[PDB]
């Protein structure tokens, strides 16, 4: 029985609640609250003989408030950046954020980047091919998602609890 906790981060409205609640709850909304506070969320996985529990947490109030981050990320064992496909500034901010695990969070974190609302590509913004070299580059798990088709976020979950030590 392993047990990490993993963290969502990006820019708001990019789609990490609806991530969480897709895998976890088989959940997805049109409307979904972004009140400030935060929720701890629980998801067990297996790999062979393998338990791997994740402790979920995902925080409204990171954008408004950006310097009470590391109170979120600290002990972080895995962390999901999430963009928007359909806009650049997410993209850009979704760097800002990997650069800052790199620096502020635990050295051996696994980090994913989740170009999220793929469901929406009539709007891309972000090529893919783009995002691929920037986590090419950063060692970085990368997948296109959406949390309303599920579209790869099963994938990217099992993908982080096998990168896992
Ligand atoms: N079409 C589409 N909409 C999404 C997706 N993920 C999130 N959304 C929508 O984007 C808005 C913000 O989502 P939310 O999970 O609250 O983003 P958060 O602020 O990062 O937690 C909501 O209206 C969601 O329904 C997706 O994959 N596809
Ligand atoms: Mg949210």
Redesign the pocket.
Known sequence: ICQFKLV?L?????????????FVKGQ???????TIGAAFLTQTVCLDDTTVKFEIW?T?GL?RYHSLAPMYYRGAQAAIV?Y?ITNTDTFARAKNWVKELQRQASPNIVIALAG?????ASKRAVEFQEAQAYADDNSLLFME?????A?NVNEIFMAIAKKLP
Do not use: C, I, P, W
């Open positions: 969502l990006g820019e708001s409205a990019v789609g990490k609640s609806s991530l969480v609640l897709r997805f909304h049109e409307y979904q609250e972004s995902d409204a954008e999430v928007d999220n609302k793929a469901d929406l998602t959406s949390a309303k088709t579209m």
